[PDB]
Amino acid sequence: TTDGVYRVMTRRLLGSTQVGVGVMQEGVFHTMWHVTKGAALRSGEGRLDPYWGDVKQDLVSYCGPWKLDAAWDGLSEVQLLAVPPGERAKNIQTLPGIFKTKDGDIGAVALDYPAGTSGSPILDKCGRVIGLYGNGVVIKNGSYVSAITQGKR
Amino acid sequence: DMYIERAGDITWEKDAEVTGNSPRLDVALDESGDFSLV
């Protein structure tokens, strides 16, 4: 199955519904846990079985261990490769904010998209995936900010 | 039952629109995977 960015679809609701987005790289499919809940996936005629997942990180990988290990450099602009339901993939460039936590700081992107955009990759200037979009907060003025959520390789 | 469909290459786009703020926020992450503002 080809490297790239993928829509995660279900037929269980009304019509065809996009519940999320993911990344195929090095033979492993990467998405957020709340998108699939760890359920298996179909890719054409083939089946993708969950391999690793963690609810607290809100991540899951299929067919193998988590492969994405690039990280935001804390300084440069990044691009969100947003794949909204029913709409063409689009790159949005932005300078990340920061989630400060008791266990360290991670990048965050203040961009709002439909729920089924969950799992869209965030990219550095070399095209490496530095994390996935869609686990975040709503701040005082009502705007959505997503963590740049990255796994461990 | 869920299935996947390719949507593109993972590639930096030279002429991308630039938008969005860079807020610095104190947050907490709970065992359920939910972020909250501290």
Partner: peptide, 7 residues
């Protein structure tokens, strides 16, 4: 975050 809330 639409109807996803935080998600």
């Amino acid at each position: 975050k639409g109807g996803g809330x935080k998600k």
